[PDB]
Amino acid sequence: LYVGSKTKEGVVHGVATVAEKTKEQVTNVGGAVVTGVTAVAQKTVEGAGSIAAATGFVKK
Amino acid sequence: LYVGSKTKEGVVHGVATVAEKTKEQVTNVGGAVVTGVTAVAQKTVEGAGSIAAATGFVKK
Amino acid sequence: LYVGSKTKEGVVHGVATVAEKTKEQVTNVGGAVVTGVTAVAQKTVEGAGSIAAATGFVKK
Amino acid sequence: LYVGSKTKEGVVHGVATVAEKTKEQVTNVGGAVVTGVTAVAQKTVEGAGSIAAATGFVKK
Amino acid sequence: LYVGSKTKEGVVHGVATVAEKTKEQVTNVGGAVVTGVTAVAQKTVEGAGSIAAATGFVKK
Amino acid sequence: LYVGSKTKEGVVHGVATVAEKTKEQVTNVGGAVVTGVTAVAQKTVEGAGSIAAATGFVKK
Amino acid sequence: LYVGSKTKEGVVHGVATVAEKTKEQVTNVGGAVVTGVTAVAQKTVEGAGSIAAATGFVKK
Amino acid sequence: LYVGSKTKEGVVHGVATVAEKTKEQVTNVGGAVVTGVTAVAQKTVEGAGSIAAATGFVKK
Amino acid sequence: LYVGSKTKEGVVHGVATVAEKTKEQVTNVGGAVVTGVTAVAQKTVEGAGSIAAATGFVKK
Amino acid sequence: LYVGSKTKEGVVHGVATVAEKTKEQVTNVGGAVVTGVTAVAQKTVEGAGSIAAATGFVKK
């Protein structure tokens, strides 16, 4: 009870998912593909956190 | 009870998943493919964390 | 009770999965393929953690 | 009770999996293939941890 | 009770798996293939740990 | 295709159920108790069908 | 295609249910109790059908 | 294809169930108790069918 | 294909069940107790069928 | 193919069951007790079939 007796940081309680009929044709050449990432929690204190960061390339 | 008697950091409690009929034709050449990553928790304090980071390439 | 009597860091409690009929034709050339990674927990303190990081290549 | 009487770091409690009918034709040339990795826990303190890191190649 | 009377690091409690009918034709040339790795725990303190790291090649 | 090539009579396709925390104290004396009957199909042609018919008594 | 090539009579396609915290104290003496009957289909042609018919008694 | 090439009468396709924490104290004297009957199909043609019929008594 | 080439009468395809923590104190005197009957199919043509019929007594 | 080339009457295809921690104190005097009957199929043509019929007594 000095930083906290219950301390629940990255929380999603209850989800229910329906997805009946799906077609998905995916085609890349040089890029990446991320499709379904359904249930996710995240806490960062000082580090650079991210979720599903999409990027094509980096040239310098 | 000085950093915390219950301390639940990266939390998702209850999920239920329905996905009836699916077709998925995937084709790449040089890139990567990530499709389904359903139940995930994450805590970072100071390190750079990520989830499903999609990137195509890096040239320098 | 000084760092914490119950300390549950990377937590997902209860999931149920239905996936009835699936076709999946996958073809790559130079890239990698990650398809299904369903139940996952993660805590990093200072190290760079990741989940399902998709990348195509790196040239320098 | 000084680092913690119960200390449960990388935790997923209860999952149930249904997957009825599946076809999966996979073909690569130079890349790797990861298909199904269902139940996974992870804690890193300072080391760089990862799960299912997909990469195509690295040239320098 | 000074590092912890119960200390359960990489934990998945209870999973049940149904997978009725499956066809899987796999063909590579130079790359590797990982197909099904269902029940896995992991803790790293300082070493670089990984799970199912897919990579195509490395040239230098 | 004369009574019907696909003939799907009592049908519920896809449901997902979340119910997190429950207390239930039940007390009867002479009556019956029905609590949870979640997934149910029914077709009757000519017979008297029913679902969860609650009745206390019958005197004559 | 003479009574019907697809003939789907009692149909509910897709439902998702969230019910987080519940208390339920039930007490009867002579009557019946029906509480939760979530997913139900029904077709009757000529028979007397019913769903969750609540009745106290019948005297004659 | 004269009574029907596919004829699927009492059907529920896909359900997923989450129920985290439950207390249930049940006490009867003369009556019956039915608690959880989750996945059920039913077809009757001419017979009197029923599901979870709760009744207290019958006097004549 | 004259009564039906595929004829699937009492059908439930795919269910997944999560039920984490449960207490259940049951006490009767003269009545019966039915608690958990999860996966059930039923077809009756002309006979009187039933599922989990709860009744207290019958006097005549 | 005159009564049916595939004829699958009482069918449940795929179920997965999780039930982590359970206490169950049961006490009767004159009645019966049925607790867990998980996977069940049933077809009756003309006989009176039943599942888990709970009854307290019968006097005449």
Side-chain angles (χ1 to χ4, degrees), chain H residues 16-42:
Chain H
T17 301
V18 179
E20 293 193 358
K21 187 161 76 176
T22 301
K23 294 180 184 180
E24 185 174 359
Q25 302 188 5
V26 178
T27 300
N28 38 348
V29 172
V33 170
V34 173
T35 296
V37 181
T38 302
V40 157
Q42 184 184 7

PDB file of all heavy atoms in Angstrom, chain H residues 16-42:
ATOM      1  N   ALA H  16     -17.272 -21.007 -27.794  1.00  0.00           N
ATOM      2  CA  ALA H  16     -16.140 -20.954 -26.881  1.00  0.00           C
ATOM      3  C   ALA H  16     -16.587 -20.365 -25.552  1.00  0.00           C
ATOM      4  O   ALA H  16     -17.311 -19.368 -25.520  1.00  0.00           O
ATOM      5  CB  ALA H  16     -14.998 -20.136 -27.468  1.00  0.00           C
ATOM      6  N   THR H  17     -16.134 -20.972 -24.458  1.00  0.00           N
ATOM      7  CA  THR H  17     -16.696 -20.732 -23.134  1.00  0.00           C
ATOM      8  C   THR H  17     -15.620 -20.254 -22.172  1.00  0.00           C
ATOM      9  O   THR H  17     -14.608 -20.934 -21.987  1.00  0.00           O
ATOM     10  CB  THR H  17     -17.344 -22.006 -22.595  1.00  0.00           C
ATOM     11  OG1 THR H  17     -18.378 -22.426 -23.488  1.00  0.00           O
ATOM     12  CG2 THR H  17     -17.942 -21.764 -21.225  1.00  0.00           C
ATOM     13  N   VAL H  18     -15.854 -19.101 -21.546  1.00  0.00           N
ATOM     14  CA  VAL H  18     -15.008 -18.570 -20.481  1.00  0.00           C
ATOM     15  C   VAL H  18     -15.868 -18.388 -19.240  1.00  0.00           C
ATOM     16  O   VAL H  18     -16.943 -17.783 -19.312  1.00  0.00           O
ATOM     17  CB  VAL H  18     -14.364 -17.229 -20.882  1.00  0.00           C
ATOM     18  CG1 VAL H  18     -13.499 -16.687 -19.757  1.00  0.00           C
ATOM     19  CG2 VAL H  18     -13.576 -17.370 -22.160  1.00  0.00           C
ATOM     20  N   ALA H  19     -15.397 -18.900 -18.103  1.00  0.00           N
ATOM     21  CA  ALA H  19     -16.106 -18.716 -16.837  1.00  0.00           C
ATOM     22  C   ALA H  19     -15.078 -18.765 -15.711  1.00  0.00           C
ATOM     23  O   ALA H  19     -14.706 -19.851 -15.269  1.00  0.00           O
ATOM     24  CB  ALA H  19     -17.181 -19.777 -16.656  1.00  0.00           C
ATOM     25  N   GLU H  20     -14.646 -17.599 -15.226  1.00  0.00           N
ATOM     26  CA  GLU H  20     -13.407 -17.584 -14.447  1.00  0.00           C
ATOM     27  C   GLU H  20     -13.600 -18.056 -13.008  1.00  0.00           C
ATOM     28  O   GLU H  20     -13.096 -19.117 -12.629  1.00  0.00           O
ATOM     29  CB  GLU H  20     -12.760 -16.197 -14.485  1.00  0.00           C
ATOM     30  CG  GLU H  20     -12.247 -15.822 -15.861  1.00  0.00           C
ATOM     31  CD  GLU H  20     -11.340 -14.618 -15.842  1.00  0.00           C
ATOM     32  OE1 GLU H  20     -11.131 -14.051 -14.753  1.00  0.00           O
ATOM     33  OE2 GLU H  20     -10.834 -14.238 -16.917  1.00  0.00           O
ATOM     34  N   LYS H  21     -14.339 -17.316 -12.190  1.00  0.00           N
ATOM     35  CA  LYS H  21     -14.427 -17.690 -10.785  1.00  0.00           C
ATOM     36  C   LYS H  21     -15.879 -17.788 -10.358  1.00  0.00           C
ATOM     37  O   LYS H  21     -16.671 -16.875 -10.603  1.00  0.00           O
ATOM     38  CB  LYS H  21     -13.655 -16.722  -9.887  1.00  0.00           C
ATOM     39  CG  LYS H  21     -13.595 -17.196  -8.444  1.00  0.00           C
ATOM     40  CD  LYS H  21     -12.491 -16.518  -7.646  1.00  0.00           C
ATOM     41  CE  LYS H  21     -12.808 -15.107  -7.232  1.00  0.00           C
ATOM     42  NZ  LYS H  21     -11.734 -14.545  -6.366  1.00  0.00           N
ATOM     43  N   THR H  22     -16.212 -18.898  -9.706  1.00  0.00           N
ATOM     44  CA  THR H  22     -17.588 -19.279  -9.437  1.00  0.00           C
ATOM     45  C   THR H  22     -17.682 -19.884  -8.046  1.00  0.00           C
ATOM     46  O   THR H  22     -16.858 -20.724  -7.678  1.00  0.00           O
ATOM     47  CB  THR H  22     -18.073 -20.284 -10.488  1.00  0.00           C
ATOM     48  OG1 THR H  22     -17.969 -19.698 -11.790  1.00  0.00           O
ATOM     49  CG2 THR H  22     -19.512 -20.698 -10.235  1.00  0.00           C
ATOM     50  N   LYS H  23     -18.662 -19.442  -7.268  1.00  0.00           N
ATOM     51  CA  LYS H  23     -19.075 -20.132  -6.058  1.00  0.00           C
ATOM     52  C   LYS H  23     -20.526 -20.533  -6.235  1.00  0.00           C
ATOM     53  O   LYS H  23     -21.315 -19.776  -6.809  1.00  0.00           O
ATOM     54  CB  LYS H  23     -18.919 -19.258  -4.819  1.00  0.00           C
ATOM     55  CG  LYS H  23     -17.487 -18.916  -4.497  1.00  0.00           C
ATOM     56  CD  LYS H  23     -17.394 -18.059  -3.258  1.00  0.00           C
ATOM     57  CE  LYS H  23     -15.961 -17.650  -3.004  1.00  0.00           C
ATOM     58  NZ  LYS H  23     -15.837 -16.797  -1.795  1.00  0.00           N
ATOM     59  N   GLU H  24     -20.882 -21.724  -5.759  1.00  0.00           N
ATOM     60  CA  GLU H  24     -22.246 -22.201  -5.963  1.00  0.00           C
ATOM     61  C   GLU H  24     -22.633 -23.145  -4.829  1.00  0.00           C
ATOM     62  O   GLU H  24     -22.296 -24.329  -4.864  1.00  0.00           O
ATOM     63  CB  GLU H  24     -22.386 -22.872  -7.319  1.00  0.00           C
ATOM     64  CG  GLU H  24     -23.809 -23.272  -7.599  1.00  0.00           C
ATOM     65  CD  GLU H  24     -24.019 -23.822  -8.986  1.00  0.00           C
ATOM     66  OE1 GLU H  24     -23.044 -23.876  -9.763  1.00  0.00           O
ATOM     67  OE2 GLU H  24     -25.167 -24.200  -9.292  1.00  0.00           O
ATOM     68  N   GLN H  25     -23.370 -22.632  -3.851  1.00  0.00           N
ATOM     69  CA  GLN H  25     -23.885 -23.454  -2.768  1.00  0.00           C
ATOM     70  C   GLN H  25     -25.346 -23.769  -3.054  1.00  0.00           C
ATOM     71  O   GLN H  25     -26.173 -22.858  -3.156  1.00  0.00           O
ATOM     72  CB  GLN H  25     -23.737 -22.752  -1.421  1.00  0.00           C
ATOM     73  CG  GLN H  25     -22.310 -22.389  -1.086  1.00  0.00           C
ATOM     74  CD  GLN H  25     -22.165 -21.870   0.322  1.00  0.00           C
ATOM     75  OE1 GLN H  25     -23.123 -21.855   1.092  1.00  0.00           O
ATOM     76  NE2 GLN H  25     -20.968 -21.411   0.659  1.00  0.00           N
ATOM     77  N   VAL H  26     -25.659 -25.052  -3.192  1.00  0.00           N
ATOM     78  CA  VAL H  26     -26.979 -25.500  -3.608  1.00  0.00           C
ATOM     79  C   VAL H  26     -27.562 -26.358  -2.497  1.00  0.00           C
ATOM     80  O   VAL H  26     -26.873 -27.231  -1.957  1.00  0.00           O
ATOM     81  CB  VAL H  26     -26.905 -26.286  -4.929  1.00  0.00           C
ATOM     82  CG1 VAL H  26     -28.264 -26.790  -5.340  1.00  0.00           C
ATOM     83  CG2 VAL H  26     -26.334 -25.418  -6.012  1.00  0.00           C
ATOM     84  N   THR H  27     -28.823 -26.107  -2.149  1.00  0.00           N
ATOM     85  CA  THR H  27     -29.496 -26.886  -1.120  1.00  0.00           C
ATOM     86  C   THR H  27     -30.954 -27.084  -1.498  1.00  0.00           C
ATOM     87  O   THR H  27     -31.698 -26.115  -1.630  1.00  0.00           O
ATOM     88  CB  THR H  27     -29.392 -26.207   0.244  1.00  0.00           C
ATOM     89  OG1 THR H  27     -28.012 -26.073   0.601  1.00  0.00           O
ATOM     90  CG2 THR H  27     -30.111 -27.024   1.298  1.00  0.00           C
ATOM     91  N   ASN H  28     -31.367 -28.330  -1.657  1.00  0.00           N
ATOM     92  CA  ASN H  28     -32.770 -28.665  -1.823  1.00  0.00           C
ATOM     93  C   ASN H  28     -33.260 -29.524  -0.672  1.00  0.00           C
ATOM     94  O   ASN H  28     -32.509 -29.903   0.229  1.00  0.00           O
ATOM     95  CB  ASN H  28     -33.036 -29.389  -3.144  1.00  0.00           C
ATOM     96  CG  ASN H  28     -31.949 -30.334  -3.498  1.00  0.00           C
ATOM     97  OD1 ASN H  28     -30.891 -30.304  -2.888  1.00  0.00           O
ATOM     98  ND2 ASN H  28     -32.203 -31.210  -4.464  1.00  0.00           N
ATOM     99  N   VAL H  29     -34.556 -29.800  -0.712  1.00  0.00           N
ATOM    100  CA  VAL H  29     -35.209 -30.703   0.224  1.00  0.00           C
ATOM    101  C   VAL H  29     -35.908 -31.836  -0.511  1.00  0.00           C
ATOM    102  O   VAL H  29     -35.575 -33.008  -0.329  1.00  0.00           O
ATOM    103  CB  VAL H  29     -36.184 -29.940   1.143  1.00  0.00           C
ATOM    104  CG1 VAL H  29     -36.992 -30.909   1.978  1.00  0.00           C
ATOM    105  CG2 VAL H  29     -35.418 -28.986   2.040  1.00  0.00           C
ATOM    106  N   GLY H  30     -36.871 -31.506  -1.365  1.00  0.00           N
ATOM    107  CA  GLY H  30     -37.602 -32.525  -2.087  1.00  0.00           C
ATOM    108  C   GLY H  30     -37.464 -32.410  -3.590  1.00  0.00           C
ATOM    109  O   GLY H  30     -37.836 -33.328  -4.323  1.00  0.00           O
ATOM    110  N   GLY H  31     -36.917 -31.291  -4.061  1.00  0.00           N
ATOM    111  CA  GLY H  31     -36.826 -31.019  -5.476  1.00  0.00           C
ATOM    112  C   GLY H  31     -35.497 -31.437  -6.080  1.00  0.00           C
ATOM    113  O   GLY H  31     -34.550 -31.798  -5.389  1.00  0.00           O
ATOM    114  N   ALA H  32     -35.445 -31.373  -7.405  1.00  0.00           N
ATOM    115  CA  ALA H  32     -34.258 -31.738  -8.159  1.00  0.00           C
ATOM    116  C   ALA H  32     -33.459 -30.493  -8.523  1.00  0.00           C
ATOM    117  O   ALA H  32     -33.923 -29.362  -8.378  1.00  0.00           O
ATOM    118  CB  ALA H  32     -34.641 -32.519  -9.415  1.00  0.00           C
ATOM    119  N   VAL H  33     -32.224 -30.717  -8.976  1.00  0.00           N
ATOM    120  CA  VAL H  33     -31.284 -29.645  -9.300  1.00  0.00           C
ATOM    121  C   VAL H  33     -30.563 -30.006 -10.592  1.00  0.00           C
ATOM    122  O   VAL H  33     -29.948 -31.075 -10.683  1.00  0.00           O
ATOM    123  CB  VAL H  33     -30.255 -29.405  -8.178  1.00  0.00           C
ATOM    124  CG1 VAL H  33     -29.169 -28.462  -8.644  1.00  0.00           C
ATOM    125  CG2 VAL H  33     -30.914 -28.824  -6.945  1.00  0.00           C
ATOM    126  N   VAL H  34     -30.634 -29.120 -11.586  1.00  0.00           N
ATOM    127  CA  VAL H  34     -29.843 -29.209 -12.810  1.00  0.00           C
ATOM    128  C   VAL H  34     -29.073 -27.904 -12.957  1.00  0.00           C
ATOM    129  O   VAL H  34     -29.671 -26.825 -12.898  1.00  0.00           O
ATOM    130  CB  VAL H  34     -30.727 -29.468 -14.042  1.00  0.00           C
ATOM    131  CG1 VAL H  34     -29.909 -29.383 -15.297  1.00  0.00           C
ATOM    132  CG2 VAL H  34     -31.355 -30.832 -13.952  1.00  0.00           C
ATOM    133  N   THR H  35     -27.756 -27.994 -13.143  1.00  0.00           N
ATOM    134  CA  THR H  35     -26.909 -26.811 -13.056  1.00  0.00           C
ATOM    135  C   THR H  35     -26.321 -26.367 -14.389  1.00  0.00           C
ATOM    136  O   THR H  35     -26.611 -25.261 -14.847  1.00  0.00           O
ATOM    137  CB  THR H  35     -25.790 -27.082 -12.048  1.00  0.00           C
ATOM    138  OG1 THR H  35     -26.362 -27.266 -10.750  1.00  0.00           O
ATOM    139  CG2 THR H  35     -24.795 -25.941 -12.018  1.00  0.00           C
ATOM    140  N   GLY H  36     -25.511 -27.190 -15.043  1.00  0.00           N
ATOM    141  CA  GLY H  36     -24.872 -26.723 -16.256  1.00  0.00           C
ATOM    142  C   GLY H  36     -24.887 -27.755 -17.355  1.00  0.00           C
ATOM    143  O   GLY H  36     -24.275 -28.817 -17.225  1.00  0.00           O
ATOM    144  N   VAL H  37     -25.588 -27.465 -18.442  1.00  0.00           N
ATOM    145  CA  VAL H  37     -25.690 -28.370 -19.578  1.00  0.00           C
ATOM    146  C   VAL H  37     -25.422 -27.507 -20.802  1.00  0.00           C
ATOM    147  O   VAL H  37     -26.337 -26.880 -21.339  1.00  0.00           O
ATOM    148  CB  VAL H  37     -27.056 -29.066 -19.668  1.00  0.00           C
ATOM    149  CG1 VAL H  37     -27.098 -29.998 -20.844  1.00  0.00           C
ATOM    150  CG2 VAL H  37     -27.371 -29.855 -18.409  1.00  0.00           C
ATOM    151  N   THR H  38     -24.177 -27.476 -21.259  1.00  0.00           N
ATOM    152  CA  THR H  38     -23.776 -26.371 -22.119  1.00  0.00           C
ATOM    153  C   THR H  38     -24.071 -26.593 -23.602  1.00  0.00           C
ATOM    154  O   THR H  38     -24.692 -25.734 -24.233  1.00  0.00           O
ATOM    155  CB  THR H  38     -22.292 -26.081 -21.907  1.00  0.00           C
ATOM    156  OG1 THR H  38     -22.072 -25.771 -20.527  1.00  0.00           O
ATOM    157  CG2 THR H  38     -21.862 -24.894 -22.735  1.00  0.00           C
ATOM    158  N   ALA H  39     -23.652 -27.714 -24.185  1.00  0.00           N
ATOM    159  CA  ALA H  39     -23.723 -27.907 -25.633  1.00  0.00           C
ATOM    160  C   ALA H  39     -24.705 -29.024 -25.952  1.00  0.00           C
ATOM    161  O   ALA H  39     -24.456 -30.187 -25.619  1.00  0.00           O
ATOM    162  CB  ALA H  39     -22.344 -28.227 -26.207  1.00  0.00           C
ATOM    163  N   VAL H  40     -25.811 -28.682 -26.617  1.00  0.00           N
ATOM    164  CA  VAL H  40     -26.942 -29.589 -26.798  1.00  0.00           C
ATOM    165  C   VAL H  40     -27.581 -29.385 -28.172  1.00  0.00           C
ATOM    166  O   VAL H  40     -27.789 -28.249 -28.606  1.00  0.00           O
ATOM    167  CB  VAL H  40     -27.960 -29.400 -25.652  1.00  0.00           C
ATOM    168  CG1 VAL H  40     -29.330 -29.843 -26.044  1.00  0.00           C
ATOM    169  CG2 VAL H  40     -27.553 -30.238 -24.464  1.00  0.00           C
ATOM    170  N   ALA H  41     -27.871 -30.490 -28.867  1.00  0.00           N
ATOM    171  CA  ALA H  41     -28.677 -30.497 -30.079  1.00  0.00           C
ATOM    172  C   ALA H  41     -29.943 -31.320 -29.871  1.00  0.00           C
ATOM    173  O   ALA H  41     -29.973 -32.235 -29.048  1.00  0.00           O
ATOM    174  CB  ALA H  41     -27.881 -31.068 -31.253  1.00  0.00           C
ATOM    175  N   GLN H  42     -30.995 -31.004 -30.629  1.00  0.00           N
ATOM    176  CA  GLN H  42     -32.247 -31.745 -30.493  1.00  0.00           C
ATOM    177  C   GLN H  42     -33.057 -31.697 -31.780  1.00  0.00           C
ATOM    178  O   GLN H  42     -33.309 -30.616 -32.314  1.00  0.00           O
ATOM    179  CB  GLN H  42     -33.118 -31.202 -29.356  1.00  0.00           C
ATOM    180  CG  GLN H  42     -34.369 -32.041 -29.146  1.00  0.00           C
ATOM    181  CD  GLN H  42     -35.299 -31.489 -28.103  1.00  0.00           C
ATOM    182  OE1 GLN H  42     -35.094 -30.404 -27.593  1.00  0.00           O
ATOM    183  NE2 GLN H  42     -36.333 -32.244 -27.774  1.00  0.00           N
TER     184      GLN H  42
END
